[PDB]
Amino acid sequence: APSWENIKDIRLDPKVHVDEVYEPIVNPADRYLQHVSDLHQYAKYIMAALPKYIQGFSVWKDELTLHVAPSAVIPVTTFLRDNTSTQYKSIIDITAVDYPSRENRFEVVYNFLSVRHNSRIRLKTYATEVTPVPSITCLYEGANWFEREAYDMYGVFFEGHPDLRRIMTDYGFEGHPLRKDFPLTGYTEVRWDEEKRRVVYEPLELTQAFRNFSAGSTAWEPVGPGRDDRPDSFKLPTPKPE
């Protein structure tokens, strides 16, 4: 008897009917507070174990950043790879960020994962256009391509790298695009020249010039100061009045 011809038309089954939808008002940051305290304690331990290297630490919403100098990259990474309580074995990303107001303009960021403990950590160093950073390819082979990309985009030289060359950009590209002084459209363009029978690189001319529209940025301060979510164990003590 039963077949696809005598099949239940589910389009006419009664649907769930809800009068009022109830959703409580909750702050998404309140979910993180205990973990934040835990990361604070953890970072305190790392700072106390490596006071020669760790300049600082910072903590925001399940993200711990460790603040070190270039000389301190290889030691701290060895610690973060081989120590039993800090088994960050997977390299996730290596990046650079241009802060041209700083004397050391580039901030080289490292992201690490521990599948053992299911935790992530971040490590930040600094660099310039001419001062290099130590390569962590000796520890993480996955860092090769990432460090290459950081060089190609920003110009950060990683000393110790086996083959540091451009990875993203054209084979004779002159410049490092993600620098803030590099323009969006770059300096050159390409066409086919029928005379030379060749693809020729020429200066830039746009039929429609780029329109930024960042002049419409808000003149009023959008978001105030945040909310202090340090635990009381990591706020300095106010002395009793008397």
Partner 1 sequence: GVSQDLPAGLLDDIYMWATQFGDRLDEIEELLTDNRIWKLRTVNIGTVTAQDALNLGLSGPMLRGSGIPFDIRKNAPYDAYDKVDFDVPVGMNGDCYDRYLIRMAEFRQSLRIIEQCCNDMPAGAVKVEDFKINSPPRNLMKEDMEALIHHFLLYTKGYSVPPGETYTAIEAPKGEMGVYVVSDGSERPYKCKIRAPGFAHLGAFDHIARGHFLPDAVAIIGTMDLVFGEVDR
Partner 2 sequence: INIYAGGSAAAAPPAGFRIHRPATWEESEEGALSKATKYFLLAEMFRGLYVVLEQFFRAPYTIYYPFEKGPVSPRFRGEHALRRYPSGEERCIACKLCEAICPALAITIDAEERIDGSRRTTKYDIDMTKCIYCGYCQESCPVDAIVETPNVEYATETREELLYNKEKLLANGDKWELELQYALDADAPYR
Partner 3 sequence: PSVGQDLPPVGGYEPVQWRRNLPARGFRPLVYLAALCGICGYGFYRALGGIQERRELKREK
Site residues (vs partner 2, CB under 8 A)? 83-85, 87, 116-118, 208, 210-211, 213, 216
Does the footprint of partner 3 cover residue 9 (CB under 8 A)?
A: no
CB of 6 to partner 3, least distance (A): 15
Q: 165-204 mask for partner 1 (x: CB under 8 A)?
A: ---x---------x--------------------------
CB of 213 to partner 2, least distance (A): 6
Burial of 110 (0-12, 13-18, 19+ CB in 10 A): buried
Per-residue exposure over 149-163, b if at least 16 CB sit within 10 Å of its own CB, e if not? bbbbbbbbbbeebee
Residue 180 carries which DSSP code? T
Binding partner at 84 among partner 2, partner 1, partner 3, none, C-beta below 5 to 8 Å by kind: partner 2
| Two tokens, residue 118 | 């299911």
Report in angstroms how near the CB of residue 3 gets to partner 3 at its nearest.
15
Tokens of 174: 């002159």
Angstrom distance (rounded) from CA 102 to CA 95 = 17
Distance of closest approach, residue 177 Cβ to partner 1, in angstroms: 12
Answer for the pair 40, 66: CB distance below 8 angstroms, yes or no.
Answer: no
Identify residues 82-141 at the interface with partner 1 (CB under 8 A).
89-93, 95, 97, 109, 111, 113, 115, 118, 120, 122, 140-141
Q: 91: which strand partners?
A: 112
